[PDB]
DNA sequence: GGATTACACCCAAGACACCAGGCACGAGACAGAAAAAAACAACGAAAACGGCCACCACCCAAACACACCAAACACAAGAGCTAATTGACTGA
């Protein structure tokens, strides 16, 4: 488990889903902090595929897969590649609440 | 009560007479003195250690002066007016 360093997704839990042996970027599952193209011309909430299909805009639909604003790849839950130096791979140590989310 | 008159008494002057203790004179002797050998004590010739005293500091202890300094500066009352962040950096 890691946490991203920059962007709007700073200092939130990201589960390392796949580790790419290219040693440039790795696959991370993360909770989208997005407004679903309604306010921008926020709290971590479960992604809504139907709402992001209804509101329109930049969207590419592959059933459970979605490519949306920011070239964001999500499935079912964002699944996207982020740099190893753009995340902290040592020193997360999660609790049970994030495990439920992901002496 | 010293002096006068009257009265009693005894003891030394005045002789002799036995004899013997002190004086003229002579002799052994011991205190005393000249002299020698040798200390020696109050009369001077000097001092040299306890007794004052001054340099050269300390040594605290204010006196003064200089500057630094922090706090104080009448009540109330009405109104208007302006500002309460703004470049800008950096993922996207």
- Cα–Cα distance for residue pair A64/A87, rounded to 1 Å: 26
Q: Are A86 and A102 in contact (CB under 8 A)?
A: no
Strands A78-83 and A25-30, how do they pair?
Answer: antiparallel
Spatial distance between the Cα atoms of A47 and A78, rounded to a whole number of angstroms: 8
CA A14, C1' B31: Å apart? 162
- Spell out the residues 6+ positions from residue A28 whose beta carbon is closer than 8 angstroms to its own: A2, A4, A14, A15, A16, A17, A78, A79, A80, A81, A82, A87
- Angstrom resolution of this structure: 3.3
Straight-line distance from CA A72 to C1' B16, in Å? 216
Instruction: Determine contact, residues A44/A33, Cβ cutoff 8 Å.
Output: yes
Q: How was this structure determined?
A: cryo-EM
- Alpha-carbon distance values, A80 to A25, A29, A36, A54, A88 (Å): 9, 7, 18, 23, 16
Do the beta carbons of residue A1 and residue A102 sit within 8 Å? yes
In the 8-state DSSP scheme, what is residue A98?
H
Distance, first Cα to last Cα, chain A:
23
Residue A82, helix vs strand vs coil: strand
Listed residue (A31, A33, A1) closest to A15, CA to CA: A1
- Give the closest residue to A28 by CA, choosing from A60, A66, A72: A72
Whether A52 contacts A37, CB under 8 Å: yes
Q: State which H helix or E strand residue A86 sits in.
A: none
Q: Give, in Å, how far the C1' of B29 lies from the CA of A49.
A: 188
Torsion over CA: A49, A33, A98, A66 (sign): positive
């Amino acid at each position: 488990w890691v946490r991203l360093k920059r962007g709007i997704y700073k200092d939130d839990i990201a589960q390392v889903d796949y580790v790419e042996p290219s040693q440039n970027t790795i696959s991370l599952k993360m909770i989208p902090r997005i407004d679903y193209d309604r306010i921008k011309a926020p709290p971590q909430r479960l992604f809504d595929a139907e709402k992001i299909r209804s509101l329109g805009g930049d969207v590419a639909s592959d059933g459970d897969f979605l490519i949306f604003e920011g070239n964001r790849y999500s499935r079912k839950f964002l699944f996207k590649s982020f740099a190893m130096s753009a995340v902290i791979t040592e020193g997360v140590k999660p609790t049970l609440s994030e495990l439920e989310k992901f002496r």
